[PDB]
């Protein structure tokens, strides 16, 4: 057992009835005195290091060639002047095991934290030394964290794509299904998580070229996609991850759900394909009134109306579908379906729940399309247009496939530096740069939507960490007040930066003129409701920072009207799995699952306390499972009212609560305006 691992395991050993949290710090020192410095490759000067990394195909020549060597050295010096120290052993371990650049033999460390941050900053700035230094100060203060793809791969020649969330629309044809399989394989090859909408696909027992009972339904397509994702597994590094979304009014919805049951046969169950269910308000109304619902055959609806079932508003179309004899449908019990969803989420955490009307009643780009499905993490909610992939030697009709750009603000570090505006604007600029530098040659609709929509996702993390280190309970009304104010400022500065980029470049996102930003509707609740903190403690937390008022929001609305907005979507709160360790932050805006988490690496045990955990804030670091899920829903809705896309919202349940409690949480989330529900993790 290594010395740093012993020093880390000494945390659980209680002295005077208290955990030895400070010992973790010592572990970090050991982890750097015994391992990191010994296995870190050192060079006589930075010029030699850069030459070795470029020549050995570690870095890219293009992004480094935009700067003189003096500017690169100045950026590296700015990164190293902070003298950044990892506060916990797990932060440094996760960085140097997951993100630090290693030799081809994987035994030496080529990149420190400062080196990786400097390289990512130089990639972000695209030739501006001052902008690169600003990015270096942003990331070394740990105010902003690029996502795992961006942080890991920026500036590296041997790399995947910087985007890892991809949403694909699948049209109801064999050509479109095969193209979807191909694109899923190509994007998993790039290292991205792929979500596919299967609602347009006709159900099982439908007609193919006017022969009856011929379609295999969406379950056969799910089997094909599951095989494709198993095959494309990042060159045998990570398990291929894919998601399939189906509307709850699709007839296959039960069989869809049956793919996640343990009792399902081998020809029914898909193991590497996550599933999500899109639930329109009509289904919730039918379940609430206990009226029996109807699941429709999509192809009959398409034949009758010329549009797909998921392309029209089910609230106004459901009665017409039911009363139409030419539309084929099957009787179901919506309450039984809700109970089945709750039971499946209890067993396996699936499916993801998308409340379609909750997403689309605040969606700014409904003119382009309504949000029909979400991503693999159930937080990307954007307009998508299906593509018509025709036969060979025939021109395809390329639509819009969602691929947003991830990046997370560290709420604790951002707010302690009183730099919400600067961090949000710099993160928006970096996300815009990464979106502009993304070029996928095997996903035509993804590339077209990246060029047109210019959608980015700016998330936040360390919400619970910040609240606990400031003596605020996550379920307290003060925490929701802080979340409201902080995320309203984040939205304000994100919109301001998007409008500034649109003014500078002279271009907005495609079909912006029809958006609620152009019409000013988006700013309605912002020009009438003041989002300043209602509690003195939160106001003192925001001291030293200008909180945008209704007049500021009116000025921003006028600015957007005059200049437009560059990004169709700006904010989405991703789970932030492993980057939260490196940043010493709690994951996403979720409450912490455990105060101290026990992990097993190799044959060794390691202990990670939550950041800033001590005896004084032990009570404020309440575990997520012990919390009331209604108050967690309230906080997530408070944040969601300022996020244009969704939030990865995992439910944290105890083994005691039943499926009725899960359904109640889901229905309260639907009532409170929650757009997506990610997971049902049972303790």
């Amino acid at each position: 057992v290594p010395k740093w691992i012993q020093l880390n395991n000494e945390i659980m050993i209680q002295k005077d009835g208290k955990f030895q949290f400070d010992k973790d710090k010592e572990a970090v020192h050991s982890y750097f005195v015994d391992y990191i410095n010994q296995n870190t490759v050192f060079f006589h000067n930075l010029k030699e290091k850069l030459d070795y990394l470029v020549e050995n195909q570690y870095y890219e020549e293009e992004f480094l060639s935009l700067y003189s060597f003096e500017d690169i050295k100045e950026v590296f010096k700015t990164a190293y002047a902070k003298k950044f120290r990892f506060p916990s052993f797990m932060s440094a371990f996760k960085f140097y095991n997951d993100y630090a650049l290693k030799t081809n033999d994987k035994k030496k460390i080529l990149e420190r934290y400062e080196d990786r941050i400097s390289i990512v900053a130089l990639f972000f700035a695209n030739g501006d030394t001052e902008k690169a230094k600003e990015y270096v100060n942003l990331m070394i203060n740990q105010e902003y964290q690029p996502s795992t793809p961006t942080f890991l791969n920026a500036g590296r020649k041997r790399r995947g794509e910087l985007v890892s969330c991809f949403l694909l629309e699948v049209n109801d044809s064999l050509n479109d299904i095969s193209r979807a399989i191909d694109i899923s394989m190509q994007l998993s090859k790039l290292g991205g998580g792929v979500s596919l909408n299967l609602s347009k696909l006709r159900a099982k027992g439908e007609a193919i070229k006017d022969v009856e009972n011929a379609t295999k339904g969406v379950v056969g397509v799910m089997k094909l996609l599951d095989n494709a994702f198993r095959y494309a597994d990042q060159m045998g590094q990570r398990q291929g991850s894919g998601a399939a979304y189906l509307n709850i009014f699709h007839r296959d919805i039960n069989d869809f759900l049956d793919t996640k049951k343990i009792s399902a046969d081998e020809d029914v169950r898909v193991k590497t394909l996550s599933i999500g269910v899109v639930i329109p308000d009509k289904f919730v109304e039918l379940a609430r009134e206990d009226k029996a619902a109807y699941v429709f055959y999509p192809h009959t609806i398409y034949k009758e109306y010329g549009q797909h079932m998921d392309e029209m508003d089910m609230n106004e179309m459901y009665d017409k579908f039911v009363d139409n004899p030419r539309v084929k449908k099957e009787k179901i019990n919506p309450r039984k379906l809700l109970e089945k969803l709750a039971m499946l989420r209890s067993e396996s955490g699936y499916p993801y729940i998308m409340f379609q009307d909750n997403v689309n009643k605040v969606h700014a780009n409904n003119h382009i399309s309504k949000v029909k499905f979400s991503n693999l993490c159930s937080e990307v909610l954007q307009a998508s247009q299906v593509s018509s992939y025709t036969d060979y030697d025939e021109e395809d009709e390329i639509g819009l496939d969602i691929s947003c750009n991830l990046g997370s603000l560290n709420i604790l570090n951002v707010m302690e530096h009183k730099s919400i505006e600067k961090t949000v604007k710099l993160a928006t600029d970096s996300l815009t740069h990464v979106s502009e530098t993304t070029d996928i040659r095997n996903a035509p609709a993804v590339r077209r939507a990246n060029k047109a929509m210019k959608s980015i996702g700016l998330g936040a993390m360390n919400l619970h960490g910040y609240l606990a280190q400031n003596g605020i309970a996550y379920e307290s009304p003060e925490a929701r007040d802080f979340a409201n104010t902080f995320f309203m400022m984040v939205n304000f500065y994100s919109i301001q930066r998007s409008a500034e980029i649109a003014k500078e470049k002279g271009e907005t996102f495609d079909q912006y003129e029809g958006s609620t930003y152009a019409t000013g509707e988006y700013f309605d609740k912002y020009v009438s409701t003041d989002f300043s903190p209602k509690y003195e403690k939160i106001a003192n937390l925001f001291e030293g920072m200008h909180i945008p008022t209704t007049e500021d929001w009116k000025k921003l609305k006028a600015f957007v009207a005059e200049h437009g907005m560059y990004h169709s979507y700006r904010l989405c709160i991703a789970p932030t799995g492993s980057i939260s360790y490196v940043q010493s932050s709690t994951a996403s805006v979720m409450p912490i699952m455990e105060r101290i988490e026990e992990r097993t690496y190799g044959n060794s045990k390691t202990y990670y306390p939550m950041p800033g955990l001590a005896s004084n804030n032990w009570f404020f670091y309440k575990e997520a499972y012990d919390m009331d899920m209604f108050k967690v829903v309230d906080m997530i809705a408070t944040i969601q009212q300022h996020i244009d896309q969704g939030i990865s919202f995992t439910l944290f349940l105890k083994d005691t609560m039943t499926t009725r409690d899960l359904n109640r949480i889901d229905l309260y989330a639907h009532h409170r305006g929650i757009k997506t529900i990610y997971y049902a993790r049972t303790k």
Partner: protein, 289 residues
Amino acid sequence: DFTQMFYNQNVKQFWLPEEIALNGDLLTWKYLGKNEQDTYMKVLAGLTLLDTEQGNTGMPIVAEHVDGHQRKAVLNFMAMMENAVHAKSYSNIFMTLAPTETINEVFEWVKQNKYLQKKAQMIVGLYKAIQKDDEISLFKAMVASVYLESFLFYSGFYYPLYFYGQGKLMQSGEIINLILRDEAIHGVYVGLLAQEIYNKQTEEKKAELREFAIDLLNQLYENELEYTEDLYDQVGLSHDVKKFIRYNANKALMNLGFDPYFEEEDINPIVLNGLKATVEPLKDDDFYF
């Protein structure tokens, strides 16, 4: 007052030989003398025969004649253990340690061995003599079964235990200890059923039943002595095994509610060392907040 606790104990003791990997015994087996391997194979073959008949005949027939669904469930479970678990485990041991020809030869040897045939003849004869609604014939068969469970197995058990206690053949030994743990509770249970029948009798009838039990024990004992000498003389252990079988004969008598018959002796200390989530429907009030 006891069947339910025996039911629970029997089902909680459930096991399969495949749970124990046997390839670890390969070397300590290879290292034994030819005499030792011969005695070991034959000993386990004698055990296999006893369990074959206890599973095929003894336990099912007693189950048939004993009243009460719970008593029958315990006896049926014990029967399954005899032939589906115990008898089969010996083949797992044989298939690991021995080549097919040696296995074939030892099963041929059980068929022609006069002591093993005599003990099977005597025990199975009593099982097949049970008459419906005749409690005395049933008692006699239960005495025979207790003598099989708590006495007759032990000339066989000695040798695996003797090795286990020296740190030899420990995987096979683990199987044997599990079998022995089962037989101990089987002997107690059948003993309690036998005592039930005995306690219904007149004093005169009881005196005859004790005579039957003691005469049968002595007859089985004398045969077991010859069997023991036949197997153990070549490994030098016959006198030691004889002390062990007398010790266990006393335990069999005690399981039947009788006083010990043989005087206490020191047993080889090596052998002593050898020992879904809950579902509620959705109410109309869960849709409003």
